[PDB]
Amino acid sequence: GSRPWQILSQALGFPNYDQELWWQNTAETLNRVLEQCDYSVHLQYKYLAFYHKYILPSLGPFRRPGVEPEYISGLSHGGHPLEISVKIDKSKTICRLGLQAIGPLAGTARDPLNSFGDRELLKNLATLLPHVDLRLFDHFNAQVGLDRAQCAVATTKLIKESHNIVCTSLDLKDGEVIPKVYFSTIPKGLVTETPLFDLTFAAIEQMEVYHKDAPLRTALSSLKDFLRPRVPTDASITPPLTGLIGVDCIDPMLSRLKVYLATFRMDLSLIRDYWTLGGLLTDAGTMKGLEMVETLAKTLRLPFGINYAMKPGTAELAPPQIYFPLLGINDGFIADALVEFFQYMGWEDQANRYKDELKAKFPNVDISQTKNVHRWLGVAYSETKGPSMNIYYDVVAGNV
Amino acid sequence: RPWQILSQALGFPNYDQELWWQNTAETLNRVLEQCDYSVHLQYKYLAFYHKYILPSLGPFRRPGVEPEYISGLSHGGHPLEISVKIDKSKTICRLGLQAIGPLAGTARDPLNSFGDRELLKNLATLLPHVDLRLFDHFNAQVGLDRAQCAVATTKLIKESHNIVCTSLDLKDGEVIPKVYFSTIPKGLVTETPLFDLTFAAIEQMEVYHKDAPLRTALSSLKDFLRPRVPTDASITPPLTGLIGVDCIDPMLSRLKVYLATFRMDLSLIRDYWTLGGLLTDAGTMKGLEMVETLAKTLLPFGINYAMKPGTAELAPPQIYFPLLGINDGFIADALVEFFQYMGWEDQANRYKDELKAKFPNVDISQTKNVHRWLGVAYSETKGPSMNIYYDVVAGNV
Amino acid sequence: RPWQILSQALGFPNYDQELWWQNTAETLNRVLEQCDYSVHLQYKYLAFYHKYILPSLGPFRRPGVEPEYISGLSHGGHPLEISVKIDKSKTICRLGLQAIGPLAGTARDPLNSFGDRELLKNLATLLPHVDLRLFDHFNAQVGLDRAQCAVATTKLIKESHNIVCTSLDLKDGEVIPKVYFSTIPKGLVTETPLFDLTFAAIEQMEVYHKDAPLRTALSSLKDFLRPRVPTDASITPPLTGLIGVDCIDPMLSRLKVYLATFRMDLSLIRDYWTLGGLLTDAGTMKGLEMVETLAKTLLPFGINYAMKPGTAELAPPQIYFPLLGINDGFIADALVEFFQYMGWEDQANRYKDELKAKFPNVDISQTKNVHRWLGVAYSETKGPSMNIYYDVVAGNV
Amino acid sequence: GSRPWQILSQALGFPNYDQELWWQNTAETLNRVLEQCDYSVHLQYKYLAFYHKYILPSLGPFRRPGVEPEYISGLSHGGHPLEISVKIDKSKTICRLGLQAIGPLAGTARDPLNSFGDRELLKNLATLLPHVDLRLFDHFNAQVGLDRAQCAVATTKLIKESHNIVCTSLDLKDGEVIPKVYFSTIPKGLVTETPLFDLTFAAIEQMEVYHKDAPLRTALSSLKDFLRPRVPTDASITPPLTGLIGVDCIDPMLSRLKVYLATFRMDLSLIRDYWTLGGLLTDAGTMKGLEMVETLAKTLRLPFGINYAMKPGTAELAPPQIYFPLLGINDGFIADALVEFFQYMGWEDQANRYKDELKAKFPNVDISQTKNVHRWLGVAYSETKGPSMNIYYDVVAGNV
Ligand SMILES: O=c1c(-c2ccc(O)cc2)coc2cc(O)cc(O)c12
Ligand SMILES: O=c1c(-c2ccc(O)cc2)coc2cc(O)cc(O)c12
Ligand SMILES: CC(C)=CCSP(=O)(O)OP(=O)(O)O
Numbered sequence A, D: 001g002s003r004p005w006q007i008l009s010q011a012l013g014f015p016n017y018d019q020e021l022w023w024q025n026t027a028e029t030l031n032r033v034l035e036q037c038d039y040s041v042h043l044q045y046k047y048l049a050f051y052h053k054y055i056l057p058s059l060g061p062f063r064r065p066g067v068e069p070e071y072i073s074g075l076s077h078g079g080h081p082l083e084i085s086v087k088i089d090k091s092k093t094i095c096r097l098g099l100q101a102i103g104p105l106a107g108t109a110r111d112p113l114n115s116f117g118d119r120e121l122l123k124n125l126a127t128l129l130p131h132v133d134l135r136l137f138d139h140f141n142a143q144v145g146l147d148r149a150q151c152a153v154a155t156t157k158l159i160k161e162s163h164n165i166v167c168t169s170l171d172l173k174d175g176e177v178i179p180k181v182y183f184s185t186i187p188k189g190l191v192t193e194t195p196l197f198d199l200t201f202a203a204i205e206q207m208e209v210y211h212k213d214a215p216l217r218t219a220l221s222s223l224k225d226f227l228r229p230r231v232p233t234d235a236s237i238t239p240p241l242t243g244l245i246g247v248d249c250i251d252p253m254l255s256r257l258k259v260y261l262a263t264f265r266m267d268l269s270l271i272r273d274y275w276t277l278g279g280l281l282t283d284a285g286t287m288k289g290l291e292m293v294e295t296l297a298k299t300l301r302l303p304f305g306i307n308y309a310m311k312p313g314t315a316e317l318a319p320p321q322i323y324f325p326l327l328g329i330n331d332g333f334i335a336d337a338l339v340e341f342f343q344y345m346g347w348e349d350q351a352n353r354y355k356d357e358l359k360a361k362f363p364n365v366d367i368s369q370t371k372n373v374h375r376w377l378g379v380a381y382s383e384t385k386g387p388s389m390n391i392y393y394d395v396v397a398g399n400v
Numbered sequence B, C: 001r002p003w004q005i006l007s008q009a010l011g012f013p014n015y016d017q018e019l020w021w022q023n024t025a026e027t028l029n030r031v032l033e034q035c036d037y038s039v040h041l042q043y044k045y046l047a048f049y050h051k052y053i054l055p056s057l058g059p060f061r062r063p064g065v066e067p068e069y070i071s072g073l074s075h076g077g078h079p080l081e082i083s084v085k086i087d088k089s090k091t092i093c094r095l096g097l098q099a100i101g102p103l104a105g106t107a108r109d110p111l112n113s114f115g116d117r118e119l120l121k122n123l124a125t126l127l128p129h130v131d132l133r134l135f136d137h138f139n140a141q142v143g144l145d146r147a148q149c150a151v152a153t154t155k156l157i158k159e160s161h162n163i164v165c166t167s168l169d170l171k172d173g174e175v176i177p178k179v180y181f182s183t184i185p186k187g188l189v190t191e192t193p194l195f196d197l198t199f200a201a202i203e204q205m206e207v208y209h210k211d212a213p214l215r216t217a218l219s220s221l222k223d224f225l226r227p228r229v230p231t232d233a234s235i236t237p238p239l240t241g242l243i244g245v246d247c248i249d250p251m252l253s254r255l256k257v258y259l260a261t262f263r264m265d266l267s268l269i270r271d272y273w274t275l276g277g278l279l280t281d282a283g284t285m286k287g288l289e290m291v292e293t294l295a296k297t298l299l300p301f302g303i304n305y306a307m308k309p310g311t312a313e314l315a316p317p318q319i320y321f322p323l324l325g326i327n328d329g330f331i332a333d334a335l336v337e338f339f340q341y342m343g344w345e346d347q348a349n350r351y352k353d354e355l356k357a358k359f360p361n362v363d364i365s366q367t368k369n370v371h372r373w374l375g376v377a378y379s380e381t382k383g384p385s386m387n388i389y390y391d392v393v394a395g396n397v
């Protein structure tokens, strides 16, 4: 074999069998994705070599028949802590990895919520890459992380696939790796009996960048005003709820702060509410995006996601990105739906390639028979940037 | 003896680790013996030191092997001190170190930003009561990105290329970690006043927002400190140079603000000790007499103001006197005197022979590096205590 | 207690290591206590077990986690046994294991060819008197390449996918390693007779070429064995199934040739014990009485013929009786009787209560897996001894 | 930078600073060598990725001003345990790595002769590559390796750069890695007070393959007859001497057994003696090779090497390969000499490229000013194969 994923297997081997299995169920797909997004051969090697060295050991054991890990991830259908996404727009497609870095004691008494692995991987990325910044990670780990006794209590109140506090994504963009993290607010909520809204914004308002950026303060103030009468005021875990805080692991003054809502109910009137922030936003751009999202929902179990991204130095809220949950829906149907949507958008080249490229991404499964390979679809509209489509795959479900 | 047994049972992953052991483990075991730790605790702490501390210490600086990272914790550049905390009843052993990352002091890690947290992570899975939330809070507020670390290394001596240090109290039968964060790099690189960036980091703590007594304590301390430390960006000691916390539940953790200064005379002892005349009670004045006597009987001076959630009132600080450059035999004789003055006759009688036995490779009458620091304190609750910091490597080479 | 102290001081790198400790360390500490090892040696051996053995043991097989490699050393597939060597004066503790490589039992390492030597390498830098030359000699003569290992796995049960095993004697205050190499895989894959490949490997040893007495001993043994083991390639027990050496200076090392057989009756005990009537002295006959009595009082049977450089004459072998399937309480009562017969009254009186205390989680009256083997020997020099092999995991779950 | 050596630095980083330094002083050169030998981009990645993972940690500390390792190698001028060679013939050029795998206690009381590192690396290569075989390694480690007390004595009788028992080469051929090892006989000789000839052949005659291969026995018998009256009969370490035994780490029945002589004296009458084995070989091929070697020596401190390679199933001895030592001779001169020799051989393409490619291999040093970059030149003639030129470089001396 002389494709990059094969050459790297040959050159590098595996320290253990779980890493081997992770490679044999993910790396071909990942190489295919990078080829399909028009990454040069040299970036295909860069990213696959990076994946081998940094990501495979972070993925822990490979859950399979007869071997049941101590730690079960909610990132995927089979309990594997891995997802692969593509972000599609007019001009280009970029690849992103999503995971949870599993510590060697994760899911046991010494580490019940897998509290250490993601920071360890980030520290290793910090000596690898000059632009990686840990300050926001550490701030939120301080504010929503829990001690061992509190993690043990959280595990009594959570199903096994939700024994987590954090997760990591890595954008493979511009020849670089750009890490981002998401912290769950649910375990602190449950353990402290504090409303999720309160502990989320209490955490955000202690950021150093919040204390010296009036615009971010103003934008956050606008978001709280929208969310306060929509999310619970009490301590309950009920929808819509503020379930994740996201940061970029870069200079705090440039990092996007994200507040992620989780909810089960969605219709056209809820879309509009979320997208326009209950009529706060009315410009042409906003309204053009709304139409797009509506059209997507017509064309097409996990909660929906609504993610409000805010950047220091911007006072006004933008529309959120909306996450459609696709678990349990047929992957052939979804592919047909995505083609239709791409036609609607005028992205005729994406439309013509989507199906073929999908089958080629997952050559060991019949896509037309699966319902768990497409797991999420995010849709976004931007200023100074256009419309975007994020497609999240359960790469392992696409391989076994 | 336990240090020898563990060496036989465990060996060493590499030669630097072996040299570290050979230059410190015998001394540690002696200290632990002298302090009346049981044999099972001597094993406990020495096994712990082997597995967790040895790899954290980096290379062992020695003739012909100049490491990339040089520590200001000792005279030879070694990132280790062993200290004792003495009161009348008992003596407690403590380790002070800098956990050295494998790229420390090179362009990928100019200020050794990662090794202490790595060590602390291993402790959090070892020990049930270790809590990293205050670490992570202050690492967020005074940590720097790579480019900023690189700038700071151009404006600071080799021995000050650090942001954090770790201490481990070998108390009761537990390991109790604490950490200090240095404010200087961030202040240098941001050209922010140390006073402002210190108190900003603290005012953003979760516990500060939760606890009215802590807030009251800190406003008295800012009042006291504001006029005495610089208002602009410079490094003009006296200055707020470190922030210390305990790696415990944030609500129990002491918060420590350390001033560094190069001037101490009777006027300034009085001023630091009493918070400018704020504290006038007999307990305070008894501690002041102590400190005055100590200074009569005998690196910047240190003043450490410590506060706890729950308590609105400030207490006298701990004062640190550097001992570098002063004969170690004179120091011992002076401490015997001072111990006699306190009425700690048993500590007076054993101090000098037990010291010689800690450092059998050296002549304490001819050395000037072995006692590096002395800290002195008085609390209403616990009473008087004295902290003696040894350059264990200098006491073994 | 030392096993608890070391757990507190060291923790665990991973959960499998923790489960190994939790299922074996308490028992080990008990054995070491019962054998009158000092506390400092209990620490020595337990610290060693933590650092060197735990990572060598691989995953801990348990419900829902089926490892890729399954060991024939115990009933649950765990690659560990603890054994005692009892004589009248004293009792010695020994560990038996298979060091599991991280790809063991998969296509990149089908017969676990590498983990034991890796462990042995770590011991050679730990311990001054460890010598790997006989290891390397027999690993050269009976080891296999990847493709051959893969063929052997198609012709052998899961529990026999191994070429080597390691034992560690906790003797005096030292760790003394020995290893056994299995001849079956090479014989299966090469379709060579076990007898020929066994004696070929041995005749190529450096020490064999150097030492005329060893050569004399071995020709008597080949004479004895040639007619009793197969001449063609088959696996027809009785067969020369293992070669054992000590990891010491080749000139001191015992060379052991182990027969495995499924038939033992009074005729065959006599034949194996006396080397077909070759050994007729009173010492031999006294040992035979012992073995006959043992077998009256109470997996293949084992016969281990041991030879030393320097000695021309063969000695009676050690005979191994498997105990799998027999009540552990009956076994204890039978051993008490047999100990009384030997006049080891002190061992008779304490054997059963000390056993229950080794394995407090089990009822020995209801178990059949805990005693796995019994070995018995008699030497002119050292006298009678008995080796009892426990499935420590089975005694703890 | 988008060359493979740069991309891999970017993707992989370094676990420690010595590995970083090894990379910054070797990897560019190694990439250049692979490019120059017409290795595809995919093999350039395969080998550089292999080098990063397996070789960099094996190389120990990077000896440099202010940092003096405990273990000093004789493989190179600066004490670095690394060499890079090219084997040149009519049709092709292949790259080879030579090293000593340094253990973490090498050169101290627990490991005075660096006795463990090379086997550890080989075991890791054995799970990486299906064709790697450890049986011959283990045989010779058994026969010429020493216990710790014996290694400590050896170190009292050897200069610091000769505190070794073994070294490893890795041929980067046909898209694979083919390991070979060389065991020194000197430490066992010194410690046991045994003649080097005796302990060399005693070791060889105990090989399992020797016991079942009459041809190898016959060929060895012919070599002993040649060497017996030429090398010492006593225990002295004097020339010519049998100083290394070499094996290939492959199926024993296919591995070439090598006996390496070290000597300081060489002239045309000694060349002929070694090459023809004192007149044992007289065929046309032999005599044509002799002429080549003579011509090379005319065109042009370490000992010369003479390496007799024997394969199971061949009864007759072939001519040895002859190693010319080049340390201390000007590297510009050597380059001019090699061009002349290549012209003589009719290898006009090699002749025209040699100088330019050399400067391009070592872009941070002026080659015309150095005398330690070319360290050895081996010359060989074969049956079923032709003439060969092996050029060994002190890559670190070419970089600092
Ligand atoms: O996967 C989960 C689960 C979940 C629910 C049922 C399952 O069987 C497994 C996971 C719950 O909350 C989430 C919330 C999210 O934002 C994303 C998720 O993937 C999950
Ligand atoms: O490098 C050495 C040295 C040696 C001699 C003097 C030095 O300063 C360094 C190495 C001696 O024997 C060899 C013998 C060899 O076959 C190859 C070598 O590279 C060496
Ligand atoms: C954790 C989940 C399910 C979604 C967040 S992705 P995301 O952070 O990458 O959002 P972007 O597409 O980067 O804007």
Ligand SMILES: CC(C)=CCSP(=O)(O)OP(=O)(O)O
Pocket: B085, B096, B165, B167, B178, B180, B244, B304, B318, B375, B387
């Ligand atoms: C010189 C340094 C790093 C710190 C002084 S704080 P300390 O912890 O050593 O003193 P206490 O333990 O709090 O008594």
Ligand SMILES: CC(C)=CCSP(=O)(O)OP(=O)(O)O
Pocket: C085, C096, C165, C167, C178, C180, C244, C304, C318, C375, C387
């Ligand atoms: C069942 C196995 C692997 C070996 C029997 S040999 P042994 O070493 O355990 O017996 P001795 O120690 O030599 O008395």
Ligand SMILES: CC(C)=CCSP(=O)(O)OP(=O)(O)O
Pocket: D087, D169, D180, D182, D246, D305, D307, D321, D378, D390
């Ligand atoms: C160790 C030394 C100096 C030379 C031997 S190389 P070598 O084994 O690679 O010989 P080949 O060119 O492979 O035939």
